[PDB]
Scaffold this active site. Structure first.
Site, PDB file in Angstrom:
ATOM      1  N   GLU D  48      -2.951  -7.810  -0.253  1.00 22.45           N
ATOM      2  CA  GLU D  48      -2.596  -6.701   0.616  1.00 22.45           C
ATOM      3  C   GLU D  48      -3.122  -7.052   2.004  1.00 22.45           C
ATOM      4  O   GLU D  48      -4.302  -7.350   2.156  1.00 22.45           O
ATOM      5  CB  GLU D  48      -3.183  -5.393   0.101  1.00 22.45           C
ATOM      6  CG  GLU D  48      -2.530  -4.165   0.698  1.00 22.45           C
ATOM      7  CD  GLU D  48      -1.093  -3.984   0.241  1.00 22.45           C
ATOM      8  OE1 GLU D  48      -0.772  -4.314  -0.922  1.00 22.45           O
ATOM      9  OE2 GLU D  48      -0.275  -3.513   1.051  1.00 22.45           O
ATOM     10  N   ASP D  59      -8.381   4.634   7.409  1.00 20.70           N
ATOM     11  CA  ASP D  59      -9.434   3.632   7.254  1.00 20.70           C
ATOM     12  C   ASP D  59     -10.801   4.075   7.768  1.00 20.70           C
ATOM     13  O   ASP D  59     -10.919   4.693   8.833  1.00 20.70           O
ATOM     14  CB  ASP D  59      -9.024   2.335   7.950  1.00 20.70           C
ATOM     15  CG  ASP D  59      -8.002   1.543   7.155  1.00 20.70           C
ATOM     16  OD1 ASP D  59      -8.289   1.187   5.986  1.00 20.70           O
ATOM     17  OD2 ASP D  59      -6.901   1.285   7.692  1.00 20.70           O
ATOM     18  N   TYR D 174       0.526   2.766  -6.083  1.00 16.35           N
ATOM     19  CA  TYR D 174      -0.854   2.814  -5.629  1.00 16.35           C
ATOM     20  C   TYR D 174      -1.580   4.015  -6.225  1.00 16.35           C
ATOM     21  O   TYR D 174      -1.283   5.161  -5.894  1.00 16.35           O
ATOM     22  CB  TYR D 174      -0.921   2.867  -4.102  1.00 16.35           C
ATOM     23  CG  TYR D 174      -2.245   2.397  -3.539  1.00 16.35           C
ATOM     24  CD1 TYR D 174      -3.386   3.189  -3.632  1.00 16.35           C
ATOM     25  CD2 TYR D 174      -2.354   1.170  -2.902  1.00 16.35           C
ATOM     26  CE1 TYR D 174      -4.600   2.766  -3.118  1.00 16.35           C
ATOM     27  CE2 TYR D 174      -3.563   0.740  -2.382  1.00 16.35           C
ATOM     28  CZ  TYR D 174      -4.682   1.539  -2.491  1.00 16.35           C
ATOM     29  OH  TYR D 174      -5.891   1.110  -1.984  1.00 16.35           O
TER      30      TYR D 174
HETATM   31  O1  LIG Z   1     -11.643  -1.054  -0.859  1.00 16.61           O
HETATM   32  P1  LIG Z   1     -11.363  -0.016   0.204  1.00 16.61           P
HETATM   33  O2  LIG Z   1     -12.155   1.247   0.010  1.00 16.61           O
HETATM   34  O3  LIG Z   1     -11.538  -0.615   1.584  1.00 16.61           O
HETATM   35  O4  LIG Z   1      -9.838   0.356   0.046  1.00 16.61           O
HETATM   36  C1  LIG Z   1      -8.927  -0.687   0.327  1.00 16.61           C
HETATM   37  C2  LIG Z   1      -7.562  -0.108   0.607  1.00 16.61           C
HETATM   38  N1  LIG Z   1      -6.767  -1.021   1.359  1.00 16.61           N
HETATM   39  S1  LIG Z   1      -5.143  -0.840   1.232  1.00 16.61           S
HETATM   40  O5  LIG Z   1      -4.387  -1.805   1.973  1.00 16.61           O
HETATM   41  O6  LIG Z   1      -4.765  -1.038  -0.142  1.00 16.61           O
HETATM   42  C3  LIG Z   1      -4.744   0.816   1.708  1.00 16.61           C
HETATM   43  C4  LIG Z   1      -3.888   1.569   0.922  1.00 16.61           C
HETATM   44  C5  LIG Z   1      -3.591   2.871   1.294  1.00 16.61           C
HETATM   45  C6  LIG Z   1      -4.157   3.393   2.449  1.00 16.61           C
HETATM   46  O7  LIG Z   1      -3.912   4.700   2.894  1.00 16.61           O
HETATM   47  C7  LIG Z   1      -3.097   5.563   2.152  1.00 16.61           C
HETATM   48  F1  LIG Z   1      -3.590   5.738   0.919  1.00 16.61           F
HETATM   49  F2  LIG Z   1      -3.112   6.736   2.797  1.00 16.61           F
HETATM   50  F3  LIG Z   1      -1.835   5.109   2.086  1.00 16.61           F
HETATM   51  C8  LIG Z   1      -5.017   2.635   3.223  1.00 16.61           C
HETATM   52  C9  LIG Z   1      -5.310   1.337   2.856  1.00 16.61           C
END
Ligand SMILES: O=P(O)(O)OCCNS(=O)(=O)c1ccc(OC(F)(F)F)cc1
Ligand SMILES: O=P(O)(O)OCCNS(=O)(=O)c1ccc(OC(F)(F)F)cc1
Ligand SMILES: C=C(/N=C/c1c(COP(=O)(O)O)cnc(C)c1O)C(=O)O
Ligand SMILES: C=C(/N=C/c1c(COP(=O)(O)O)cnc(C)c1O)C(=O)O
Ligand SMILES: [Cs+]
Ligand SMILES: [Cs+]
Ligand SMILES: [Cs+]
Ligand SMILES: [Cs+]
Ligand SMILES: [Cs+]
Ligand SMILES: [Cs+]
Lengths: 395, 264, 395, 264
Positions: D48, D59, D174
């Site tokens: 990703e 984030d 997801y």
């Molecule tokens: O391990 P962490 O806590 O840093 O999480 C990693 C997530 N990275 S990601 O690209 O999958 C990702 C997936 C969804 C996100 O926002 C949403 F849910 F609103 F769509 C943001 C980042």
């Protein structure tokens, strides 16, 4: 010779240099004329409504009386344009100045709210305004110095004496004694020589008039007591006046206790001074054994004054009004309590009145009582002072 | 009868009065007494003496600062009356007038104040913040104790005020030169003078802003009985605080010149 | 699926992470329920009247239109408790928060007036309030930081990005996405995801309603135009809403021109940005060629925001409202002019609206026109900023 | 068909996926490419990859700061697509998913964005601030260009949302671990997993707050197809900015351990 009585019992009069008597008589005549003039009254009413924002709200406290039998309302003079009750009577006196053909204004100020009122009225009505302010007050009420100057007023710091309100008063009066042909002295409180205690009362009495109408609408009866802080006496006599003949309504005035009456560092001459002659009037004052005028003290600049208006001395003497004192620390607690539990930031002056009301409640919490506090101003001018204190106390 | 006797003497000599003002106890009790003896020796016809007051509302910065100097030296009204007794003991005939503010007279009894004035030999009291309209208990107490109550005739006095001042006052009439407060830097009328004479008022002394011989001469030529000078005198004290002997010499020169002008 | 339309033409929507959709739907349902609930409406009305001080005055300018054919009124939201229009809709949203069983409030603020409103409503109604504020704004609007904290709110400086309003917005939204179960996000402008642009309009529309009644009473007709500054859009849509169907009434919104549109240092996306998706909405924004969100600039913190509410973008697109810009220097001149000639110290935000009205008058001084400016706030928060500028320019 | 092929392979091996997240171009383009090659060599099943955006609202501070580092290195979306082409040229079968914010996709045309994705060989796009309710033009453009549009199943998803996510999404679903924003420090459901399978949704990857092998194993044991870890990975980059080789060694150890846990 006057048209109106210059005395309230033993108190009041016109103790000014002879040079100023014609100015005082002229002012009295102009006031008497204006009070019977429908065009003047309409102009005054229009400014009060459409420019200053009257009538002001009467707010029921939702939280600070919880668990007691006290019902507490606040008369919201803090919502008036300018941020305090001072604006009411300045609009009236400015109209009187114009009526007398004056184009200049002299004012004194301590909290800076009368200064701001004088400045805004002068800007609106086309007068040239100069304001005397004690140098100590220039520092502890600085936001109002900035406001006055932005509105084009000349602000003159006074470094003599205690560098507070009485010293600004002295300088304003000295100025007027030489400039009265072209300048009106816009005295900011219900004190000084006749006719000012009378004019200031009559141009502030809408506070109590509105309060009476509002409390009758909301409670169907008169208050058990109305409570106001007392510097020179204008917001208190403004609240009191319409209730004086309602004998069941308590009138309570709150003088500043400063660091405590026993320290001598206070501003409570009505209950702890003795009668003297100063600032154009015969009134209670803080004075030495020999008759020198003592310097007052209060955390609040607007109450930091060693005398009091003569009508309050009279109402006290006959027992129609009761007067009490509240210390700096009591006022600060009330300030904090209103901020945190009602979301209103009160002037430190007004916090003295609120503190006494809270005491009436807390001391006798099962006493049924309907109280009104005159919230004479907002506390924006005080927030830097209060912050510095709290920080220097943990908090 | 000290003013009456003075003005009669001056009239027989075709002369005006020159009357200095100083604050009692400025810059200290001993130096103040020497200052006053110098004023008299240099030709003062009468004296106007201030009792230090915390908030003198008819005074500009020069005399404000005189009051402050006296307070810094610890001067009280009690000490002023001690000084007055000493001055009178030395100088039996010179008229002595006090400049008072109301609260110092009112403080612990009006009658008692004027009684103390009589005992030390004061001739007149001018209460600066008591207009004729408020004057009754003051002038009554004054007359009961053989003190002349002094009243002010301002430049724009109407006829009623002229009649009141003529009737109520004794000793002399204070003819105000101008509006405002005391001050040398600010310089300041035949109709008023003639009217006061018509109403048999006490003789007029012009005061406020008189700091030059020319002004004294002009006062007397206009028909005033004399003139009062305060701030001009006090400035000489203020200027010479570190030089006491130079102070007295400059005081002497100034007072002598002002007195000379009263003969015009 | 929603009860109400989330779009104004192409603009608006609900562009938030999926996690937050149930919170937005819950808020919408609660609003729709409350709008038909007589008890809710009575409680809201009572707070507006007796606590905040509505209705606010409509003031005719006496001096600044001299010699022209312009008649100018100011709608005095500066007289509202708190010192700005922000207080209106915060009282409504706080009641909605309680209705939904929330006990915590999250807010963002730039000028600190929405922060102060959020803090005072939370103190009154018993909510725990945390406020995000850009670190630059913490400095240039410091009096409001002091006020918020005295009322017990937590104020959290935001140092990321431009350290101004958009950055405080970002942090508030990030917070909410994790705390929505117990916290209500009290968004302070007519922007963001549905239903906020709709709720904020409906809880501000008393501004225009009152204005219409007041101008009909005083002039016997509707204004030729109503003029308001536009940050996110709440005071302007509040003034505009009741006039939208009065086709003869001009609606003029004033974006901040900052140092000049040509410098790129401004906050005027409606006329100089392009449509994008950010802060939960599809709306005009300041963005780079690649679609990064640009930092805005204005001397006024309340207008310093790189987007605008979607209803304003819609009203512009169909030509029902016109939008213009006013630079820092033009706003400062209007600020000074109102202080000195009407005795009212306006917020620097509001000064942008006043500046454009003064321009309409000065450019065509023999044009007959009846204008209303929404004076959205008082300038106490700005007086130290303005003083420093004037001093650094002689004055 | 890269996700379909991956999950089939993993299923035949009775294995879960481990999918790291990094920001493209953090801390620079060249080091980012080496980081990504290290992730793959250490056992990443898919990637990703974030395109740096000015205001990433989903984030937390760790990935906020990754975006900032990339911007300090001058990274643009154009440069990200150049990187993507290079990554795909080296690694023909590994599924590559992009984490996008809406404005970067919408900016100069949604269709054109997904067309660029197809040309460089991207397999999926997750637009973080576009909920299913606003998703129509995005998922339509995605499918037109053979890109899987990724949708989020939050912990409190109702049945309607479950059905929509199952129908609209492709590639993987997801599965959000918790509310809030991305973050290692904040750690985060069988009913959702079973329901998604019932509705024939794309296989679920759990994400948000997964920073330990134990959490990866727990995800797969609960029936998820795998897990995503971002902040944990990015922290290793942030910690070792001055030590590029130590960075890659620590990345390798961590990714290998996380992948091992996916076999539980
Ligand atoms: O391990 P962490 O806590 O840093 O999480 C990693 C997530 N990275 S990601 O690209 O999958 C990702 C997936 C969804 C996100 O926002 C949403 F849910 F609103 F769509 C943001 C980042
Ligand atoms: O020479 P200047 O300008 O200092 O004037 C000297 C005056 N000194 S005084 O005692 O006669 C004197 C007389 C009257 C005063 O006030 C009053 F008029 F209101 F009564 C004040 C001082
Ligand atoms: C003396 C001043 N203010 C007094 C004041 C007072 C006390 O003055 P009065 O007793 O005249 O009301 C009470 N409340 C407020 C808000 C005040 O500002 C002044 O502003 O100059
Ligand atoms: C952003 C803020 N203020 C905005 C503001 C504005 C601009 O915001 P709206 O466009 O939402 O009215 C106008 N006038 C005043 C007095 C304001 O305080 C704030 O106080 O948080
Ligand atoms: Cs109660
Ligand atoms: Cs007092
Ligand atoms: Cs008092
Ligand atoms: Cs006009
Ligand atoms: Cs804006
Ligand atoms: Cs805008």
């Amino acid at each position: 010779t006057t048209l109106l009585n210059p005395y309230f019992g033993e108190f009041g009069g016109m103790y000014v240099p002879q040079i100023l008597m014609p100015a005082l008589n002229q002012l009295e005549e102009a006031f008497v004329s204006a009070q019977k003039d429908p065009e003047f009254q309409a102009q005054f009413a229009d400014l009060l409504k459409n420019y200053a924002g009257r009538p002001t709200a009467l707010t029921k406290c939702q939280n600070i009386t919880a668990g007691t039998r006290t019902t507490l309302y606040l008369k919201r003079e803090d919502l008036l344009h300018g941020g305090a009750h001072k604006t009411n009577q300045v609009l009236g006196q400015a109209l009187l100045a114009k009526r007398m053909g004056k184009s200049e204004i002299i004012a004194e100020t301590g909290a800076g709210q009368h200064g701001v009122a004088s400045a805004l009225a002068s800007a609106l009505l086309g007068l040239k305004c100069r304001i005397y302010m004690g140098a100590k007050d220039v520092e502890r009420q600085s936001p109002n110095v900035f406001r006055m100057r932005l509105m084009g007023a000349e602000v003159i710091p006074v470094h003599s004496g205690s560098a507070t309100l009485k010293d600004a008063c002295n300088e304003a009066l000295r100025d007027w004694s030489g400039s009265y042909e072209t300048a009106h002295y816009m005295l900011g409180t219900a004190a000084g020589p006749h006719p000012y205690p009378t004019i200031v009362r009559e141009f502030q009495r809408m506070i109590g008039e509105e309060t009476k109408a509002q409390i009758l609408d909301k409670e169907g009866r008169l208050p058990d007591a109305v409570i106001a802080c007392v510097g020179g006496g204008s917001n208190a006599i403004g609240m009191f006046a319409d209730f004086i003949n309602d004998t069941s309504v308590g009138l309570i005035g709150v003088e500043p206790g400063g660091h405590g009456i026993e320290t001598g560092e206070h501003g409570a001459p009505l209950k702890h001074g003795r009668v003297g002659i100063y600032f154009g009037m015969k009134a209670p004052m803080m004075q030495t054994a020999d008759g020198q005028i003592e310097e007052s003290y209060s955390i609040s600049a607007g109450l930091d004054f060693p005398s009091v208006g003569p009508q309050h001395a009279y109402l006290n003497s006959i027992g129609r009004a009761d007067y009490v004192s509240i210390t700096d620390d009591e006022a600060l607690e009330a300030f904090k309590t209103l901020c945190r539990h009602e979301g209103i930031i009160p002037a430190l002056e007004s916090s003295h009145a609120l503190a006494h009301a809270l005491k009436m409640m807390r001391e006798q919490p099962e006493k049924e009582q309907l109280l009104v506090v005159n919230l004479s101003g907002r506390g924006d001018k005080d927030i830097f002072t209060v912050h510095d204190i709290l920080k220097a106390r943990g908090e | 009868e000290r003013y009456e006797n003075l003005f009669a003497q001056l009239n027989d000599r075709r002369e005006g009065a020159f009357v200095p003002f100083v604050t009692l106890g400025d810059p200290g009790i001993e130096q103040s007494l020497k200052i006053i003896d110098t004023l008299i020796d240099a030709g003062a016809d009468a004296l106007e003496l201030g009792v230090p007051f915390s908030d003198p509302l008819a005074d500009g910065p020069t005399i404000q600062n005189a009051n402050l100097r006296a307070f810094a030296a610890g001067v009280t009204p009690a000490q002023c009356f001690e000084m007055l007794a000493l001055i009178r003991e030395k100088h039996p005939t010179i008229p002595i007038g006090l400049l008072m503010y109301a609260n110092l007279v009112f403080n612990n009894g009006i009658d008692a104040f004027y009684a103390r004035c009589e005992q030390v030999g004061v001739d007149s009291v001018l209460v600066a913040d008591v207009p004729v309209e408020e004057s009754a208990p003051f002038r009554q107490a004054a007359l009961r104790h053989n003190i002349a109550p002094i009243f002010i005739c301002p430049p724009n006095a109407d006829d009623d005020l002229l009649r009141q001042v003529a009737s109520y006052g004794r000793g002399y009439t204070y003819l105000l030169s101008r509006s405002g407060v005391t001050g040398a830097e600010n310089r300041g009328l035949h109709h008023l003078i003639e009217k006061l004479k018509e109403y048999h008022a006490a003789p007029a002394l012009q005061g406020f802003g008189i700091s030059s011989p020319e002004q004294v001469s002009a006062a007397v030529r206009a028909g005033a009985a004399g003139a009062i000078s305060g701030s001009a005198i006090v400035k000489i004290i203020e200027k010479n605080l570190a030089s006491p002997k130079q102070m007295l010499a400059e005081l002497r020169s100034f007072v002598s010149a002002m007195k000379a002008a009263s003969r015009a």
